[PDB]
Design a binder for this molecule. Structure first.
Ligand SMILES: */C=C/C(C)=C/C=C/C(C)=C/C=C1/C(C)=CCCC1(C)C
Ligand SMILES: CCCCCCCC/C=C\CCCCCCCC(=O)O
Ligand SMILES: CCCCCCCC/C=C\CCCCCCCC(=O)O
Ligand SMILES: CCCCCCCC/C=C\CCCCCCCC(=O)O
Ligand SMILES: CCCCCCCC/C=C\CCCCCCCC(=O)O
Ligand SMILES: [Cl-]
Ligand SMILES: [Cl-]
Ligand SMILES: [Cl-]
Length: 269
C-alpha cells in the first residue's frame, strides 16, 4: 500500500545492506524487551505517586519492540535473494507503521515526564492534552509527508515544515514545564531533569533528519542510514530516556520516604 510510496521499494540491496538493516531492527527488539524486564522488576521500588511513569516505560518498550519486530519480519517478507541481490518480491514493507505507532508511544513518553515533574490534577490533565494534540499534529502531518518521499519531495518538505511547527511548539511546552517545575524536584532530580530535556531535544531531532534522507541521500545506503538513525533515536528517546525517568522516579520516591526505594538505592550504594 504505502510500500511503493517509500524509497526502500526503489532499490535492490546487497546482502550486506539488507542484513545490516535486519540486524539493526532485531538488535532494537532485544534491547527494548531486555529493558522491559528491568523496568518491570524495578517498579516495585517506585512509590505509588510515580509508579505509573515506570509502567509507561514497560508499555513503550513492548509497543516499540513490537513495531521493530514487525518491521524486521516485514523487511524479510518483502525481499528475496535473487540473482546476487535482495530484490523486492512484494508490498509488505513501509516506515508508515512507525508513524502510526508514535500516536501511542509519544503520548506515553510525554506523560511519564509530566508525572516525575510532579504535575497533578488539572495542570497534569490540561498539559497532557495540549502536548498530545501537538504531538498528534506533528505525527499526522509527518505521516502524510512521508507518503510523498518517492514522487514529490517538495510536498514531503512542506508537510515536514508543518510537522516541525507542531514539534517546536511541543518542545516549548515540554521545556517550559521542565524549567518551571525544577524546584519541586526531590533528591535532587532537579538537576537530572534538565539532562532529560537535552536528551529529548537531541534524540527527537534525529527523526526529522531520518525523514529528510530521501531528499539528500536517495539511494540504498540512505535507506540504511535512515534505519540507523531510527535505531539511535529509538534507543535514546525510549530506552535511555526511560532509564533516566525511572532513576528520577526512584530517587524522588526515596527522598519522599518510600522505604522500598530507600532500600533499593541503599543496596546499590
Ligand atoms: C520513540 C518515538 C519517538 C520519540 C518519535 C519521535 C518523533 C518525532 C519527534 C518526529 C518528528 C517529525 C518532524 C519534526 C518533522 C518531520 C516529520 C516527523 C514526524 C519525523
Ligand atoms: C545509541 C544506539 C547505538 C545503535 C548501535 C548501532 C550498531 C551499529 C553501529 C555502527 C556499525 C556501522 C557499520 C556498518 C557497515 C555497513 C555495512 C553495509 O551497509 O554494507
Ligand atoms: C487528547 C487527549 C488527551 C488526554 C490526556 C490524558 C491525561 C492523563 C492523566 C491526567 C488526569 O487524568 O488528570
Ligand atoms: C542532533 C541535533 C541536536 C539537538 C539539540 C541537543 C544537542 C545537545 C545535547 C547535549 C546535552 C546538553 C546538556 O546535558 O546540558
Ligand atoms: C557512551 C554513551 C553513554 C550512554 C549512557 C547510557 C544510559 C545512562 C542513563 C541511565 C540513567 C543514569 C542516571 C543518572 C545519574 O546517575 O545521575
Ligand atoms: Cl506515593
Ligand atoms: Cl514507537
Ligand atoms: Cl547536585
Amino acid at each position: 500500500p504505502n510500500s511503493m510510496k517509500n524509497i526502500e521499494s526503489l532499490f535492490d540491496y546487497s546482502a550486506g545492506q539488507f542484513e545490516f538493516i535486519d540486524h539493526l531492527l532485531t538488535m532494537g527488539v532485544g534491547v527494548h524487551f531486555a529493558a522491559l524486564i528491568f523496568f518491570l522488576v524495578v517498579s516495585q521500588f517506585v512509590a505509588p505517586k510515580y509508579r505509573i511513569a515506570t509502567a509507561l516505560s514497560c508499555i513503550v518498550m513492548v509497543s516499540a519492540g513490537l513495531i521493530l519486530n514487525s518491521q524486521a519480519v516485514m523487511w524479510t517478507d518483502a525481499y528475496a535473494y535473487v540473482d546476487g541481490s535482495y530484490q523486492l518480491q512484494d508490498l509488505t514493507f513501509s516506515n508508515g507503521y512507525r508513524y502510526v505507532n508514535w500516536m501511542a508511544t509519544i503520548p506515553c513518553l510525554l506523560l511519564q515526564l509530566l508525572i516525575v515533574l510532579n504535575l497533578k490534577g488539572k495542570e497534569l490533565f490540561s498539559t497532557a492534552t495540549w502536548l498530545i494534540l501537538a504531538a498528534w499534529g506533528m505525527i499526522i502531518t509527518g505521516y502524510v509527508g512521508q507518503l510523498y518521499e518517492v514522487d514529490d519531495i517538495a510536498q514531503l518538505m512542506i508537510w515536514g515544515a508543518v510537522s516541525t511547527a507542531f514539534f517546536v511548539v511541543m518542545n516549548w511546552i515540554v521545556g517550559t514545564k521542565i524549567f518551571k517545575n525544577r524546584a519541586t524536584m526531590l533528591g535532587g532530580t532537579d538537576s537530572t531533569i534538565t539532562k532529560v530535556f537535552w536528551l529529548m531535544m537531541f534524540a527527537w531531532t534525529l527523526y526529522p533528519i531520518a525523514y529528510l534522507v530521501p531528499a539528500f541521500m536517495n539511494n540504498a545506503d540512505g535507506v540504511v542510514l535512515r534505519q540507523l538513525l531510527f535505531t539511535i533515536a529509538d534507543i535514546s528517546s525510549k530506552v535511555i530516556y526511560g532509564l533516566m525517568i525511572t532513576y528520577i522516579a526512584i530517587q524522588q520516591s526515596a527522598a519522599a520516604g518510600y522505604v522500598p526505594a530507600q532500600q533499593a538505592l541503599g543496596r546499590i550504594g
